[PDB]
Ligand binder design. Sequence first.
Ligand SMILES: O=P(O)(O)OCC1O[C@@H](O)[C@H](O)[C@@H]1O
Ligand SMILES: [Mg+2]
Ligand SMILES: [Mg+2]
Length: 292
Amino acid sequence: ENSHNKARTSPYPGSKVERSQVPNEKVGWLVEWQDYKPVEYTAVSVLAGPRWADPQISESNFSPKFNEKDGHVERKSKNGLYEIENGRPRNPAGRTGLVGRGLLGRWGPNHAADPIITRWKRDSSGNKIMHPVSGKHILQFVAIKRKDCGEWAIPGGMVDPGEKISATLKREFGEEALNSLQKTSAEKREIEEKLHKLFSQDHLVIYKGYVDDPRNTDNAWMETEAVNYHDETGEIMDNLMLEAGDDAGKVKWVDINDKLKLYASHSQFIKLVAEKRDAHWSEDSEADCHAL
Ligand SMILES: O=P(O)(O)OCC1O[C@@H](O)[C@H](O)[C@@H]1O
Ligand SMILES: [Mg+2]
Ligand SMILES: [Mg+2]
């Protein structure tokens, strides 16, 4: 019973555009609202028609195949089918008060991928560390500090046109967490060997689908695929130094626990990983709120 909230904040990112107000009871498309009048807005950068953006719906020869693989553009939503009304997609989470695409290049789902690389925290002797409160070992994951807003986050990113989610995962992690774009060539082989063995081991899909994002509109929204590549022994990430890509101010292994503050919905993803890996999570048991 919780409506998307970030997707209804104003002004729209990178603009002064104010979204039309949407009472929570009228978020669902199923709810009748004849007077609903969303503000129309698509960023100039998207309207300019770059290679990563779709044409406007009116463009004569533009015939998108929604809810399916449409060439080098994946139009399927990972939450199932989304409705087409008035020739364009309808946000599956509901009304947002704004039509058009805002800063999103694609009509409909705009896919991203979030590679969560984890390993157990280890001491000077290479042994795991148990937390006394949970009795579980502490897990860490590779996080980057965003240059634009300085928020810590999973090193993810947009799926490029024609790119496979698996490639986006490998590419985003390497480029921003290892800085593969600027590493002794050939030495890039090893990063590929290691990431290869790492991303070849069995991973876990943590989350797929809609992401409540301030860039979302009634017609275009963000979706992600968060996947966890875990290094159980530590052998793989062992000798792989983290180096920030040019899009990150910092990069480092971050201890996982319920106190973490991360970008977007990344902390929800981290909580799920700790659950699946049976890692420590509860920092404080508020025992003092009950004990004499
Ligand atoms: O931050 P950018 O790369 O611009 O958009 C990508 C992503 O934004 C979030 O919705 C997802 O979790 C994914 O990390
Ligand atoms: Mg990117
Ligand atoms: Mg990014």
